[PDB]
Ligand SMILES: COc1ccc(C(=O)NC2CCC2)cc1-c1cc(C(C)=O)n2cccnc12
Ligand code: NA
């Protein structure tokens with residue numbers, strides 16, 4: 412059993428995960444691979460956690476989905492230094508999400524949806 416909003420969020424999540432072929436954003440970061448992570452980053456987030464929330468119908472809106480997506484990217488831009496692959500990939504993914512899920516793009520989706 413699924414709903415229109417779950418199918419829409421699954422589509423955005425799939426498109427964003429395509430930009431992360433190696434799965435750096437696929438599951439939670441552990442301190443063993445990222446020293447000090449859990450001290451620096453107080454509110455972890457990852458694409459696997461977001462998928463689970465979609466399945467449990469925990470997002471009321473695209474705005475709520477975007478807030479978890481932005482948190483994930485911000486954590487990576489805060490913890491990692493700028494010359495690292497994780498910092499650079501976080502910027503690429505976040506730029507893609509801004510364009511995919513902007514207020515303007517959603518407006519048009521709604522009108523067509525009416
Ligand atoms: C779930 O997180 C990961 C999973 C797998 C890998 C990984 O396979 N990295 C290889 C490229 C050289 C090792 C890295 C990460 C990873 C993500 C991140 C993030 C998102 O900050 N990170 C930061 C420092 C070190 N490793 C990571
Ligand atoms: Na945080």
Ligand code: NA
Nearest residue numbers: 422423426511
């Ligand atoms: Na799209």
